Amino acid sequence: MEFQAVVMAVGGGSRMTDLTSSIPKPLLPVGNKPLIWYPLNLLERVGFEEVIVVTTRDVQKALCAEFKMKMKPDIVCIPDDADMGTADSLRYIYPKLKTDVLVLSCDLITDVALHEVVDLFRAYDASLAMLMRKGQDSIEPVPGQKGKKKAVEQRDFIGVDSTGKRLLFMANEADLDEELVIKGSILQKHPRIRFHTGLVDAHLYCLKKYIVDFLMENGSITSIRSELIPYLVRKQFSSASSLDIYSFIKEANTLNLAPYDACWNRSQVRCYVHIMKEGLCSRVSTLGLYMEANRQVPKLLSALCPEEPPVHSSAQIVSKHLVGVDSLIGPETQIGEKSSIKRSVIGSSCLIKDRVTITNCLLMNSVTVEEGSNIQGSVICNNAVIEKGADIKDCLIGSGQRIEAKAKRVNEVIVG
Amino acid sequence: EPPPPLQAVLVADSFDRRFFPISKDQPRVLLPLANVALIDYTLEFLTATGVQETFVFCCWKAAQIKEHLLKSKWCRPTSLNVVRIITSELYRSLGDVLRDVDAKALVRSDFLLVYGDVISNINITRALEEHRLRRKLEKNVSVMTMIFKESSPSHPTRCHEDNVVVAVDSTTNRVLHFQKTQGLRRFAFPLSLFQGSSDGVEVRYDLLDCHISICSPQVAQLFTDNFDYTRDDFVRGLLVNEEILGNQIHMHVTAKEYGARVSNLHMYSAVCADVIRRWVYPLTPEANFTDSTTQSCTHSRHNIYRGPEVSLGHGSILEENVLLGSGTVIGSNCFITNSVIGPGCHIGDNVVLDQTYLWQGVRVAAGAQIHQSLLCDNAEVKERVTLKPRSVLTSQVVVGPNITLPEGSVISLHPPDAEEDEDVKMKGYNPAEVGAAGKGYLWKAAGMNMEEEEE
Amino acid sequence: PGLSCRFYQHKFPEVEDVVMVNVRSIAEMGAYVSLLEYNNIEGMILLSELSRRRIRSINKLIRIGRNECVVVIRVDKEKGYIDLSKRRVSPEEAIKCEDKFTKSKTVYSILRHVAEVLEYTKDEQLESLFQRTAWVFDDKYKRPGYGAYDAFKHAVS
Amino acid sequence: AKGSELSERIESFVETLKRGGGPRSSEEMARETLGLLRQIITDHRWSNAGELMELIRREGRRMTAAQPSETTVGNMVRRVLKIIREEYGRLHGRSDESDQQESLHKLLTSGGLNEDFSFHYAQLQSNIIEAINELLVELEGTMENIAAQALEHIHSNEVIMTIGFSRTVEAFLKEAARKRKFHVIVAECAPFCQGHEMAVNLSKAGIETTVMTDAAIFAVMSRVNKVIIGTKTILANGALRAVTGTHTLALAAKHHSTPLIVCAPMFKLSPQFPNEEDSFHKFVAPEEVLPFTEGDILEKVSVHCPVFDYVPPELITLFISNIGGNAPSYIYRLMSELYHPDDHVL
Amino acid sequence: FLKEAARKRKFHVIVAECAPFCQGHEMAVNLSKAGIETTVMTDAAIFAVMSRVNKVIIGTKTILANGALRAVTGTHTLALAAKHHSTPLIVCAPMFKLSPQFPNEEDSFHKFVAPEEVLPFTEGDILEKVSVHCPVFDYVPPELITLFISNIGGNAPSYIYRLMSELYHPDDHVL
Amino acid sequence: RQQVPTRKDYGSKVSLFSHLPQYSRQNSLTQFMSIPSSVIHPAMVRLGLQYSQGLVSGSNARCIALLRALQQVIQDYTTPPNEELSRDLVNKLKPYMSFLTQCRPLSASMHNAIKFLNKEITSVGSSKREEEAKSELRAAIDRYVQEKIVLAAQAISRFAYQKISNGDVILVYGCSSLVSRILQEAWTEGRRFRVVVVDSRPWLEGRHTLRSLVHAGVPASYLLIPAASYVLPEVSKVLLGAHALLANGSVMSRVGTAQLALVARAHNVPVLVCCETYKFCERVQTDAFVSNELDDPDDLQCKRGEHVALANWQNHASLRLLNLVYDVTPPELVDLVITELGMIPCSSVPVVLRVKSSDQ
């Protein structure tokens, strides 16, 4: 087997603690489907037939709860109380690993051709292959963050070669004292280094098996994205030849099989990257990213699963002429007459009365809205209920919260 | 509103002692590279690029520079490049020259700033057009355009002293950071470069400094304002103080054209080798761009340039990349390769010359073995003399018979450190180092710190 | 439309009279050209009268579609034969012919534009217009071509 | 006025020859040289033909030494010298000419010649200027005369191979393509890949054209019916100084007995034999062959970039000029009636 | 050979008539029935047309021990014309046509048929003083042959000797 | 799905080469294949990706890479319960070779290695256990690499050491590992000589050779192929490497090799060809048109000045770019062939094959 796909899905949401309380992060309903469905579905269209999904008890229960795929997952549970990292999870599931690993994350919504990365892993015999997207700017208001309060957002400095594929430099602004230092010999080997700051890490690493073998004998590394990848990039130019990473490489490079008796146009560790400047590639880890992904999902869902209609078959809508093309309706979801839904995703088992305008909103399951209520650019959690004529704009209402009738709360996080 | 004719400011003084003690008796701009003075190379480059007025600023040995210039091709009435010589004893840096340029109001529009030791065939028309377009679109923002040449860091024309690393916004070719990598093993770039441009902040170490600039008069104005300012000081101050003054420095990179500065002996050797091997075409030894009767030659196979009235001994072999000055007499069974020999030289029999540069009037006795050595005007070498690599003999220096001067040895008629400390007790020529009938003094690491001794 | 008229009054040139011609075809005896100043009447530049030195091919010095200044050496109004020589034309005569042709063409263009404005449709109308305006000045000043242009220049002011 | 402008124009021409040359073609080079020589004849003061010839030779020596590879300047200088000789002999009472000027067995047997240019004739200048004007007129149509012979050397569905970018060959092929259909294969002629441009223009005319590197000349020659090339210079024995890689193309054509046709005008004929002179090839900077970004590898490697190739006359089948078609064995005659042997060495 | 090639490829065939027995005409008709663009010409135009011919493919009657050919008449001229233009000459002959007889002499090489084919009997008295000869076969030296295609594959004419030794015994060369 | 989709032709081809495929390096075959490699073994997919992108080039390098990939495929092979190894392995290897051909037409060395491996697999007894057969096959492949390439190269270098003399000027073309090894070992053993490296667009493989010749300290000149006629007066020997030697003696090599042979013959210069006997072929070619490889036409674009000629060359309907890869040198232009069996005439190719076939 060439690869063994692994989905890292313990659950984060450090910047989404408001939503990661009613349900785990992998189970967030992006486009009327759980979030973890989007990575796995990718592996379906690619051709995978076996995954090692490291999750918790609830996510494993959800995975067996009539989840829709054709491949057979191998769900592995971990002690929730125990604190671990992604590298720790790889250390845990090491006995199941026999070939090269393809590590993903349960937040990546993308329409990228996976081969674009995997070919970089194949042709160049790369130790590591990464996927990044060009930096993008969010111009739409986050539902809940309105008084600025913008963080510093320590940028990642990524220096690639002239070809735009090889990874030469990788640093984080937190570790730099206002000075980006280059080793010098790196510039001697690669005189030109393109530098990017806004690149988004999609967490789609393709790691060789000896990387995990080296991870076995080293416990200092706990995270893959923050520690393993920068360590590999640094060791790329850390000369050659606890035990170092270079001792675990015991396979001859396919590009240098016979150093003599043949011509091929020291560098054993090689990290490559694919920077995709166009198309959809999002990592749902913030409220704004989640809302943007919900907004842009309908085209992806129409392309990936044309069989599924945008409106569920078992949906009772009196006004079946006031729903936008991008709007999605889940199962049940009784919607009354004279109710207009424009570019909004509606969950399942939702109670919608008449004279309700849902503009650019995200409604979860068991969401009730009464007569005359208008919602614009807002997110409703599970089991939440809306009273008569309540006007909501850019608000995050938590699970089971009750809003007073005709209470015009705007840009307020209503969390109980 | 057509721009006025292009003008150039040529600095004929290096304002440093990088050629000591050879510069004690001869200005740097008059040192013959392939039998042609460096200032002639610079003036030919300026004339070819379309410069109509040239201001030559001479401080050190300005009389000799003026005397040489008056006889040159560019001081003739038929020349389209009018050369005006300005001399002063109060010049100590390029800052002084540019401050005097501002005080005299010599330049009204964009001009060329070069030193008198720049060898190049670059046509500046494209870079000048880009500079003018940038200044037209954004008024008085971009003030200087430096010219760089694509090169690998391992090329022999890239000494560690003049190596630079540039952080550049590749979208607009704007220089954001400029640093010199002499003695460094880890280059530090401030994060302030990554403020506005989120895509192109290319860190380039493949740029060779041609030391050619297209400067607006704002450059002279800023040199006057900042009286503490060399060009590197100006560039660093401009890049640091971009907040106070919204001035910018851009760059133009040429790949198909040659350009370099002879700032030390290593660069001199590299540039001479490149010139002999036609890397600066059409500035080749046979082209006779100086229009002098004594500097004409014919170019045979293997880049062998032979002048008129050159006698070659029987059995002599000129391997490759050899330039022979007019009137040179070479003995029998000689082996000359990668060497430049000036006019009037006399070479004995069974003499081996490898990567050596003999200037006018050098006499070499039979049986000598010279490798990577420079022999200045009228130097003499006796029999059974071996010169190890990077050995320099200055003017009127004689080396006695049966010696083997080690690597890095410099022998000059000037005392090694007497007048250096004095800046009276005539010291005899030590035969233990210059031999019998040897005239000169061994010049140790006191002046060797910036001589032909490096990687 | 295709309105055309002679630049001068007389319908045919005279011997020893430098004229502007346009080469139209190549033949055995010489180059068949059209006289530009005389309503494009046929003439022949003789092969013998082409160069003082020996010439091997007529195409060496004659290109189809190129104007030439040639001196008339033989006129037969009955047969319609006009013989032209390029060897006998001096450079000063060529310059004079060029200037005269330029002036005459300017006058002809002015008169043709006037006729087009007046919606003239036949060459007889253009000939009459030339009779009234240009050739009157030409034979008043006793200088064909020059006189009409000089009189027109005397106008405006 | 006269001198202050004439000397300035001479200096400008010499400097342009020394450094560059611009996009100037061979026809433009010849026209400018002829204009220079005409102004020298008109403006400068010369009493007899001897002084004029000495002055013209003195100017031509400098013009030629400016750029030896540009032989059109020397060709035009020698043409003007021959014109002066012819006019003076005509005015000196020698009856027929262009035959006694050249050494001949019949001339040697039946007498000889005793040259003397000391006599003064007031009508010499006008005759010389008229002859130069005739030369310029011929220059204005030499290209059309060459192109007019296209249909006599190309048949239907023929494969024609060419190297480099020659405007004469381009006009020849475009004239042929109006009435005929044929396939053209152009070698790129590295390092200056001018052939690429030659392939684009021929493609704009609707001609089925194919581009290939110089390495594939021998491989493709087996299926090539005719070879049509330009040249920079035609030497006195019929040899060629063409673009680099033309000798290889000629050898490949000779292997398959493919005819090789050289479309070159009259002013490209130079009376200089390829004896030696060490001034045949023109070596441009080695930047075109090996880039400067190679690195330290360049400090021990000898890179040479010759521009021109010498093609011996044995490999040439036909010369097409404005005067028609000739064999390489007749070129000597075209020498004798164009240039005087005493003017071979300026 | 040509009909097999023509199934997947398009090419133009030029057939010489090979006078006096103009069998080439038939060769041109059959190749025309297969849709191959074919052209007939006399043996006088071989050299004229060879300049535009890329390949030569011929049969043979006998392959001699040194790689030479005993082919139809006019084949030596075709081989010379091909050698002038360096056109490859391919001989498509099976294994049983290989003969261990060297072309030393034996005065039994050519086969002279009646001169009726060359000069008709109806010429008259002109035939009583005119010597008419009609050889049928031509000797093609091995230097003009590029390749031999047989049922065992392709070989150079320089390897034919080996195909001799493994097919015939030297003691059986002279029956 | 089960069959790999055929690679698409890039652009219009020359009418004389319309029977050969023409592919673009950017359009790879892996776009429509499953990332977890099914149908085609992952080693074969990686090898084909390296072939189609030009990462692995050269006859010896391609053959060695193919043999290593085949070793990987054999190691991961399980015999079906109702099948025999001798037939199932041969049947299984065929789609892999078809995919490799789609990625890039196979070199002669690769074809000969494939034939040898198929013969070895067929000759496996049905009574042998699966693991024993796999170990024997891997050992056979290792022996093939060791004897046909490494020891052959050493023997060829030893033989060619005799031809090289002091003061010689040897002209080499392109990149050939055998030629570079011969020159390096001759320089090490004490011979003093110059090497002139002739290079050609667009691959510029000769630069490779140049670099090696400087690491060994050999003096080296460098120039392009059109200037060859200028440098051949100095040259005393031409030393070429061959991608294949055909049964009729023809040398199938990089395009321009026959050109150099012709010009060297015109300049009266001996031409030597270095080739391992494992690259000798039973096919015959009379020209470079019947069988050849058409590389990416876009590689013919050049950067001259600020403009770029041939940019958007597909917009011109009558414009075709011909990036020929190979060419055929007739045996009359080759003076000598140096193989592990010694120095032989160019006409001794068919006999050597026979000598190497009577054993098998």
Ligand SMILES: Nc1nc2c(ncn2[C@@H]2O[C@H](COP(=O)(O)OP(=O)(O)OP(=O)(O)O)[C@@H](O)[C@H]2O)c(=O)[nH]1
């Ligand atoms: N298997 C496993 N997955 C984890 C673990 N911690 C977080 N994850 C998930 O795996 C993804 C990748 O890890 P990181 O990108 O480093 O996440 P993080 O460090 O917790 O930072 P945040 O994404 O902001 O929460 C995260 O998005 C989490 O959802 C873990 O310990 N084990």
